[PDB]
Design a protein around this ligand. Structure first.
Ligand SMILES: O=P(O)(O)OC[C@@H](O)[C@@H](O)c1c[nH]c2ccccc12
Ligand SMILES: O=P(O)(O)OC[C@@H](O)[C@@H](O)c1c[nH]c2ccccc12
Ligand SMILES: *Cc1c(COP(=O)(O)O)cnc(C)c1O
Ligand SMILES: *Cc1c(COP(=O)(O)O)cnc(C)c1O
Lengths: 394, 255, 394, 255
């Protein structure tokens, strides 16, 4: 029994060991309660505005669309404190943890971006944050590891198993299985077992709500489409949610195509994987023929995830949202284009969404269309990645 | 199911508890794993709990995670595991054989087809570690249609509602997480499948305590696997050490 | 003859070769005209808001002041597009350049931060930006050099003279002496010859105006003091300007003390240098006994400047603003304190202002005082600097 | 001032233009610089324009910037420059000597004191490169009180107002930036100090053209300094090359 439906059509659910069900049920109830509590809402709003910097700007990019009938706006989550949309929901989850009487946060991170977000909200709200990280990742992520420790989070190197993210997640959940009365597991995307896909969406939906008010103010109508990159699905569902019942508005999710779908080195399970059960949910995933979870790939670490949130699988299945893929090369070109023409250095994750809008524009230059791309983050973090690739390509 | 029912009736007639080793199929290799399993049986295992290596075993402890890696290094696949299962049943016709699975390997080619294959090779039960009772309907239905006992974990944080569901839906045995006198009493009150205590059982005194608490037996995994882990270079010593440990744990279960 | 007074008391003026006076006079007139033009103002406001992200938040930092009677707010210029307050005024200057019919921008940069700011405004507004940089700096500034070129700016390595900043400035002014009809020299701080100290201040004054409205909204009164770091003086004069006639409000400028004033390795000319004439202005500067301009120093490149804006020298002389210094070690401790207690990684420049507020608080913990620190920028850029120092200190 | 007035009266009586070399005092060393200056005089310089190395010479071209660096490498300071100036006047009593200064070295120990020191050593004029007429009041007043000619640059973008001020405030010579017939005519109309064209003068034909345009002479700096720059390893060759270049440029100025 749950208060909310754990499924979006056949996708979602709570595929966790029995011992974690009470933690999930407790979280769902605290979240339902929090959503009806004006005080919680006022506190979350105050932090979003006065600490994180919301509302974020909606920037019209005229230079990039010159000569075409496309009008493009970028929702500026790259201007949010921390440099990415992740900040929104970790602040909400940290408030839920406190509502449940918890003073500790458990997270795990690969690239280190969720780790940084978890650590900053925890520093701000007086929570002892411990982040599990595969030893292999700790080694390859010095900058973010340092940021996490500067902010007081305990970064726990995991050497068990293969010493990668799956090993960190494992240890994190085990920890949580024994400490959930005093610790909250802060999941970093709109995936995993219910209630997380729902919570993350609701804690990121201000992206879409603001975009709606801003576009109505500036253009006097809704967008023909909102476009967002999709790793686990949080920034995209955050942008999409408020427009779901506005059926004239297209919702386009962009998965990473990596070196190309045909090469198998990509992170596009929604359109090119197969339904499976893992990470506590039933969802499309990249898997071998006999059911092992495949390794995903993208030039962008933030989109290097082998599955996708269930609500996206569902919106896709009923045809309400369409999902496409963008390769490393297309993302890199979009990255360079935005720097040069708008003076904005976008995250490589976000460059996948921008790349797809650039393609919609360039393929049909005389098509009149009002598009909004969710610029999920800034790309200062990607400067060396891009530099070395370009240097390598002479 | 029949094999578990038969085993527990016999053990009960002997006022004896069951000792059930857990090992990962294929660890450290297919041949060595089959020899390991035959040694556990000869040394006294009443039943077996066998893991099929999965890439993302969210609930496997450190020792078990390392067993999965060794099996993957040997190239073990679910298909090879089923071939090993067939051969193990072909050698031991009465010992209950239970699988410890992760949902995706059961769901992958169709839930019903998975339980059909278990029936075909002679497996008796399946515990899907990441399927709580709330999501168990398709799994337990498929298991029953193929005469496989669906196994549920009764954790320490279980409430009355969970006890009743577990008693009602499970067959073969109830997996009682040690991390209990009360949990055991209610399970019996609700007529649950005999309970086997699992988690951290590594010494003979824990096996006698489990039986004394009212459990029908005990499962030991990490302690067995560590023996494999420490003797990878001396297969002979590995089996000898395994025989000694299992024999000691099994004696602890006798009246 | 000029439209505005070139001096602030004895400080300021136009000490440039005769050939540059027409360029200065032209700029002063365009600026006076622009200030009376509602269209220019609307355009500058639109860019500040929809592209740069203004207004920036005013964040109350409760954790850091716990146990004392100090209430501290941080004006969040670190949330401005680009990560620092510099963005405000380069957007205004780029608009002035266009108003004068110019399509090219000339800038020079040492650390590379002004370079990045100039390049992004130029990319946005369709201006060909060329940035002179001492060859020694280009080598030691790969990241920012790459950012500049990603944004389309031509980064010109200077090998003339000693191949440092002074050499880049020299070449930049020479360039400007011959190209001013079509090129605008974008000065990056509130210093140099008139009209720049005035223009930069007016184009950064929104920092102080917003702070005033935000503090009146949240506290119902003005701050007891506003505190800001001082390199050339732009973020500090931007914070101070709107409060100058509010005589109850203290204005505290913080110069870098480097390794300590007594060691001579610092960047605190205002309080420890001597009046001189250089860079087109009469102002306090670090100089040898026989008049050569001394080399300044700070762990923070952005505050490593041997002089200070004239309006600061003036406010100091009449006692309206007080200036102090903060050492590298005090700035580093403030940096760590903010990361750990508020989850905000501040620029090392800004950490000097924060360090001084922390000292006002800690030295007199029972003194009731409402302080606002101008958090001029974010410190992602300083992570390796801080890391290595800490690693070096074991 | 008297020396310039006397020089221009004599040159005019000979229908001749002035050739004025510019070098940086101390480049490449104090001794070599004094020998360089004596060679320029012996070879025909009518006057000298001398730079005092400054750390931040915003208006010095590339060749000159390198001369400052060589002088600084030799440890040249303003005090050593004044000692060199005294010695140069002590050897050549009539040649006009003009300084090219940056404001801070004049302002450093007091504007009036700086012009007093110039008078003491026998300097005749001072051009402060970064002081436009608008900021010149204290400098030109101090110069006149000490009988030093205040020199102003008349740039190419000069308007009528600038011409009148320059004609009115300057003494000795007017520094006419070549980057002119009209600028020269107005300067004479306003009775400005005789004009010397400067910037890029490197060949004899430019010296004759300057005089033909109405200028009273020409200044050459980078061309002279490059000769120093290219022969740093052969002091003898440096002086020989300097003698040849100055002698040629000076001949170009004769009727
Ligand atoms: O290793 P232990 O502490 O003896 O416990 C047995 C347990 O590991 C084994 O039965 C097992 C392996 N994987 C699991 C996943 C879920 C629940 C139980 C298991
Ligand atoms: O080097 P040129 O092109 O021959 O021009 C002389 C000029 O360099 C010299 O007079 C000079 C040296 N420094 C200056 C500063 C300002 C004006 C003029 C100067
Ligand atoms: C983490 C990240 C993403 C990917 O995660 P979603 O949950 O799919 O949003 C996208 N953009 C940025 C900038 C990120 O940091
Ligand atoms: C450039 C910089 C400064 C120093 O310059 P001011 O003109 O004195 O403001 C201060 N803070 C940051 C973050 C800077 O980038």
């Amino acid at each position: 029994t749950t208060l909310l439906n754990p499924y979006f059509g056949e996708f979602g659910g709570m595929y966790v060991p029995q011992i974690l069900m009470p933690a999930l049920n407790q979280l769902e109830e605290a979240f339902v309660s929090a959503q009806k509590d004006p005080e919680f809402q006022a506190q979350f709003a105050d932090l979003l505005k006065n600490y994180a910097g919301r509302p974020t700007a909606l920037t019209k990019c005229q230079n990039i669309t010159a000569g075409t009938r496309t009008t493009l706006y970028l929702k500026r989550e790259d201007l949010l404190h921390g440099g990415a949309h992740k900040t929104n929901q970790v602040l909400g989850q940290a408030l839920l943890a406190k509502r449940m009487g918890k003073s500790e946060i458990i997270a795990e991170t690969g690239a280190g971006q969720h780790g940084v977000a978890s650590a900053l909200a925890s520093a701000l709200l007086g929570l002892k944050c411990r982040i599990y990280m595969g030893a292999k990742d700790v080694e390859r992520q010095s900058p973010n590891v340092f940021r996490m420790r500067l902010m007081g989070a305990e970064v726990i190197p995991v050497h068990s198993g293969s010493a990668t993210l799956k090993d960190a997640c494992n240890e994190a959940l085990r920890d949580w299985s024994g400490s959930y009365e005093t610790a909250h597991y802060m999941l970093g995307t709109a995936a995993g077992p219910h209630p997380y896909p729902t919570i993350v969406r609701e804690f990121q939906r201000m992206i879409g709500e603001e975009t709606k008010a801003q576009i109505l103010d500036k253009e006097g109508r809704l967008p023909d489409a909102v476009i967002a990159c999709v790793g686990g699905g949080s920034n995209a569902i955050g942008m999409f949610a408020d427009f779901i019942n506005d059926t004239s508005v297209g919702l386009i999710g962009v998965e990473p195509g990596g070196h190309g779908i045909e090469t198998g080195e990509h992170g596009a399970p929604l359109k090119h994987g197969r339904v499976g059960i893992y990470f506590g949910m039933k969802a499309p995933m990249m898997q071998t023929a006999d059911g092992q979870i495949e390794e995903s790939y993208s030039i962008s670490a933030g989109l290097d995830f082998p599955s996708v949130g269930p609500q996206h699988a569902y919106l896709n299945s009923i045809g309400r949202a369409d999902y496409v893929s963008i390769t490393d090369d297309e993302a890199l070109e979009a990255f360079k284009t935005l720097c040069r023409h708008e003076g904005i250095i976008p995250a490589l994750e976000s460059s996948h969404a921008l790349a797809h809008a650039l393609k919609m524009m360039r393929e049909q230059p005389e098509k009149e269309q009002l598009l909004v791309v969710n610029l999920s983050g800034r790309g200062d973090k990607d400067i060396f990645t891009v530099h070395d690739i370009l240097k390598a390509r002479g | 199911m029949e094999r578990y029912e038969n085993l527990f009736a016999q053990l009960n007639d002997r006022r004896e508890g069951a000792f059930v080793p857990f090992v990962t199929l294929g660890d450290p290799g297919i041949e060595q794993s089959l020899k390991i399993i035959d040694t556990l049986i000869d040394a006294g295992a009443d039943a077996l709990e066998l893991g099929v290596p999965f890439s993302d075993p969210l609930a496997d402890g450190p020792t078990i995670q390392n067993a999965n890696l060794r099996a993957f290094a040997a190239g073990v696949t679910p298909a090879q595991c089923f071939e090993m299962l067939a051969l193990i049943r072909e050698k031991h016709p009465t010992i209950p054989i239970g699988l410890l699975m992760y949902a995706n390997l059961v769901f992958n080619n169709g839930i019903d087809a998975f339980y059909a294959r278990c029936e075909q090779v002679g497996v008796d039960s399946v515990l899907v570690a990441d399927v709580p009772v709330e999501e168990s309907a398709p799994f337990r239905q498929a298991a029953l249609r193929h005469n496989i006992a669906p196994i549920f974990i009764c954790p320490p944080n279980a409430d009355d509602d969970l006890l009743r569901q577990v008693a009602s839906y499970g067959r073969g045995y109830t997996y009682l997480l040690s991390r209990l006198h009360h949990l055991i009493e209610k399970l019996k009150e609700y007529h649950a499948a005999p309970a086997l205590q699992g988690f951290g059982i590594s010494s003979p005194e824990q096996v006698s305590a489990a039986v004394r608490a009212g459990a029908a037996g005990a499962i030991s995994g990490s302690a067995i696997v560590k023996i494999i882990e420490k003797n990878l270079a001396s297969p002979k010593q590995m089996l000898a050490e395994l025989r000694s440990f299992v024999s000691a744990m099994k004696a602890a279960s006798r009246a």
